[PDB]
DNA sequence: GTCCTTAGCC
DNA sequence: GGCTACAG
């Protein structure tokens, strides 16, 4: 009882990029923000199976990259296209079922507990989504079938790229003892590293050890969570994801500390940010600044009314102001972000 | 329900 | 780098 079916699309900018790009088959490809600085000042989004045998992987600088590649193919990221790509199927996904949670921009978890019999009609179901989606976008995903949402996604780690992988009540419990802590999702390189030490290699071991020795640690939301699993207890629903705060952040060419040469940034990623609201009105604005050193430092202020884009203007720089006073250091990057909408 | 600094994700 | 939620 309770079917959950998982949806990864497999290394998806760069996927677009290939489709797109029929001069890209074969090679590798690493798609990339360019910081608008110097010369590949950046970080990469994404590189498609060919680059990564090679370590150029999300969140290395680019730089980095063409140390070890020097002459895959790099492109900037186009944000607004694989934004395209994946709304349209994210709907060809919601025809299949309407209990759709929609995690990123690439993986959406569908609850199918109404729609099939047990996990052979699922891994059927499975089947037919994956080909639809590459009939219509030429995109290949990632399937995952398991007994909850956590176990969806581990199932598709097991089988990515294009494929399908399920993962039955019994297997749940092997990989409960002897699967690696760190592949478990919401927990990447900073928790295992936090755990790395402590002895706890996989989820079991979170059982052989104190309640409180963990929750003071990773913290205690995330150390029920973990327990959770390990109990083989686990059954969070498949609910709409609301987005809660949209923003825009930019980095400066010059970074310093001069509120008049920072102020024409800091509009720009305003204009954009309503830009993005469409139509939604937030009670609260929050201005981010990244330092010359890059320690995120941000003042906010919230409202009992909804902000129009022209206060969202001038309540901007006295946050903006606020900052360059009691943070002592340059600024690099700047934005604003809105929340708490009407 | 509010100011702020903290990790997993493409 | 840019995004967004999450942690108390
Ligand atoms: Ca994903």
């Known amino acids: 009882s309770m079917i959950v079916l998982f949806v990864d699309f497999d290394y998806f900018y760069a996927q677009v990029e290939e489709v797109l790009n029929p001069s890209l088959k074969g090679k590798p490809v690493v798609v990339c923000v360019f910081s608008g600085r110097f010369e590949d000042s950046g970080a990469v989004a994404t590189a498609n199976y060919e680059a990564r045998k090679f370590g150029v992987k999300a969140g290395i600088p680019i730089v980095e990259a063409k140390k070890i590649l020097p002459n895959a193919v790099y492109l900037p990221m186009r944000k607004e296209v694989y934004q395209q790509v994946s709304s349209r199927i994210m709907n060809l996904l919601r025809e299949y079922s309407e209990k759709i949670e929609i995690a990123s921009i690439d993986e959406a978890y569908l609850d199918i507990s109404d729609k099939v019999r047990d996990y052979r009609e699922a891994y059927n179901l499975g089947l037919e989504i994956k080909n639809k989606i590459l009939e219509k976008e030429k995109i290949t995903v990632t399937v995952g079938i398991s007994k909850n949402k956590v176990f969806a996604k581990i199932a598709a780690d097991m ?54 020795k963990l929750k003071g640690m990773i913290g205690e939301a995330k150390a029920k969570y973990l327990i959770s699993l390990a109990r083989d207890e686990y059954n969070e629903p498949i609910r709409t994801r609301v987005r809660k705060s949209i923003g825009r952040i930019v980095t400066m060419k010059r970074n310093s500390r001069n509120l008049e040469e920072i102020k024409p940034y800091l509009f720009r990623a305003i204009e954009e940010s309503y830009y993005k609201l469409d139509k939604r009105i937030p009670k609260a604005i929050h201005v981010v600044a990244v330092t010359e050193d890059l320690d995120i430092v941000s003042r906010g202020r919230t409202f009992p009314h909804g902000i129009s884009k022209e206060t969202a203007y001038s309540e901007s720089v006295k946050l903006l102001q606020k900052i360059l006073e009691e943070d002592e250091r340059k600024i690099r990057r700047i934005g604003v972000r809105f929340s708490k909408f009407i």
């Open 159 to 212: 089988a990515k790229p294009n494929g399908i992988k399920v993962i039955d009540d019994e297997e749940v419990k092997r990989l409960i003892r002897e699967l690696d802590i760190a592949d478990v999702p919401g927990i990447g390189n900073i928790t295992a590293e936090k755990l790395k030490k402590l002895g706890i290699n996989k989820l079991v071991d979170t059982l052989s050890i104190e309640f409180d």
